[PDB]
Amino acid sequence: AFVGTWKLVSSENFDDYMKEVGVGFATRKVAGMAKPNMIISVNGDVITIKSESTFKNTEISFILGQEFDEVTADDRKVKSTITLDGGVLVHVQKWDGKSTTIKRKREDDKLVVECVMKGVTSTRVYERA
Ligand SMILES: O=C(O)[C@H]1CCCN(c2ccc([N+](=O)[O-])c3nonc23)C1
Numbered sequence: 307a308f309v310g311t312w313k314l315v316s317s318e319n320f321d322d323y324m325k326e327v328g329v330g331f332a333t334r335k336v337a338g339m340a341k342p343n344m345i346i347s348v349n350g351d352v353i354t355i356k357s358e359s360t361f362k363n364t365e366i367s368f369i370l371g372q373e374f375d376e377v378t379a380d381d382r383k384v385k386s387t388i389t390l391d392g393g394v395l396v397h398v399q400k401w402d403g404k405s406t407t408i409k410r411k412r413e414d415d416k417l418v419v420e421c422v423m424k425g426v427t428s429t430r431v432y433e434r435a
Pocket of ligand 1: 327329
């Protein structure tokens with residue numbers, strides 16, 4: 307359901323989200339005008355999510371319910387746990403007593419990414435490439 311190549315088509319509140327996470331202005335400026343592709347693949351237990359953009363490429367590979375070390379696009383060193391809850395991929399990142407949740411869900415033709423940090427929610431919609 308998640309496997310594919312996905313292109314960003316809309317975004318709400320992403321600058322506020324990155325500011326709440328603690329991302330500096332210059333990174334927010336280039337990350338916000340980026341229009342990434344998200345490439346999701348699976349082989350057995352291992353899910354890979356790639357983000358490709360002219361700002362930064364990133365990749366995570368993980369097993370559901372197995373905490374892993376992640377370096378984010380903004381260079382945060384986080385402890386990440388991804389689970390699959392009612393069709394939703396729920397990704398929690400924990401660092402310095404803080405946390406952020408990124409939910410990836412399939413709604414109609416879209417892949418919806420909901421990013422929560424404290425009182426800020428950002429919603430990013432992707433469509434198949
Ligand atoms: O995949 C998506 O659409 C977004 C999900 C939430 C995490 N994403 C982010 C991207 C980039 C930067 N950055 O600062 O360059 C972030 N900083 O915080 N979060 C960031 C991508």
